[PDB]
Design an enzyme around this catalytic site. Sequence first.
Site, PDB file in Angstrom:
ATOM      1  N   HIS A   1      20.177  64.883  94.779  1.00 51.22           N
ATOM      2  CA  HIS A   1      19.458  65.830  95.644  1.00 51.22           C
ATOM      3  C   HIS A   1      18.054  65.331  95.924  1.00 51.22           C
ATOM      4  O   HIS A   1      17.455  65.685  96.925  1.00 51.22           O
ATOM      5  CB  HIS A   1      19.498  67.290  95.128  1.00 51.22           C
TER       6      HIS A   1
ATOM      7  N   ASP B   1      25.560  65.368  90.997  1.00 53.70           N
ATOM      8  CA  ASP B   1      24.162  65.254  91.372  1.00 53.70           C
ATOM      9  C   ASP B   1      23.558  64.036  90.684  1.00 53.70           C
ATOM     10  O   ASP B   1      22.853  64.135  89.657  1.00 53.70           O
ATOM     11  CB  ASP B   1      23.393  66.538  91.034  1.00 53.70           C
TER      12      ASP B   1
ATOM     13  N   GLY C   1      10.271  69.172  90.548  1.00 53.84           N
ATOM     14  CA  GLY C   1       9.552  67.904  90.367  1.00 53.84           C
ATOM     15  C   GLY C   1      10.024  67.151  89.122  1.00 53.84           C
ATOM     16  O   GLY C   1       9.723  65.963  88.954  1.00 53.84           O
TER      17      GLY C   1
ATOM     18  N   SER D   1      13.371  67.184  88.507  1.00 49.40           N
ATOM     19  CA  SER D   1      14.690  66.739  89.002  1.00 49.40           C
ATOM     20  C   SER D   1      14.834  65.226  88.982  1.00 49.40           C
ATOM     21  O   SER D   1      13.890  64.508  89.325  1.00 49.40           O
ATOM     22  CB  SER D   1      14.910  67.214  90.432  1.00 49.40           C
ATOM     23  N   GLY D   2      16.018  64.753  88.589  1.00 55.63           N
ATOM     24  CA  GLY D   2      16.305  63.319  88.599  1.00 55.63           C
ATOM     25  C   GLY D   2      15.908  62.617  87.317  1.00 55.63           C
ATOM     26  O   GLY D   2      16.405  61.520  87.027  1.00 55.63           O
TER      27      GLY D   2
END
Length: 240
Positions: free
Chosen positions: A45, A93, A186, A188-189
């Site tokens: 995402h 994801d 922020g 995320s990932g």
Amino acid sequence: VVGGTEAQRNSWPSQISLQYRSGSSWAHTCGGTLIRQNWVMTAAHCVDRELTFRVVVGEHNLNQNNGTEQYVGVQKIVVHPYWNTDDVAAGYDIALLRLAQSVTLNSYVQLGVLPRAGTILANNSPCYITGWGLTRTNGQLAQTLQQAYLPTVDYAICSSSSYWGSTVKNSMVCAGGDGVRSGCQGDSGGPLHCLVNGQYAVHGVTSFVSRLGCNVTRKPTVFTRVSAYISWINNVIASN
Ligand SMILES: [Ca+2]
């Protein structure tokens, strides 16, 4: 990260900052995990938008010179083929970024260790989320890298009605949910690092939190389960 503490500079050398070009400068948008000298694992995402992306490794404070940063362009983006932006709850994801140059490893820049395929953590396993994400729901990004202690919440609990229900899949890891500490926008990932047989491994890629807020009791932060994707990760790296 809500309810975090400042990470020591050399605690999590595989954490990277994924940034996009914004005018004359660059803005942090997501975390990532350095997994090869020229490959970063992040959330799908994080790279839905058609932006120019760079990776910063050896980063600690986003707002000042650490003397340790290396900056590298993203050369190729490989999103998991089953990923659907309209449906984060479906899973998948995860994305791999090939870097334009191979980064140099040192105390601040190291490959993240991944779990063996299929590994599921027992309920309440000790983990840390790390990131520069919002420090409060609807807040602002951290300047310094933050960490928060977020014990796992197993699939049976996490997918129960008072938690996430059908929203959570077995391809995901839940952690936290105490109403105090959590991932936030922020993060995320980025990695969920969990201590197993004396060694931290990156068991999660930060994926989502509740629409109601970041630190919401019984809405633990949800991560893509890295150990579900070991073959996919290897296949991409081998063919690219
Ligand atoms: Ca810096």
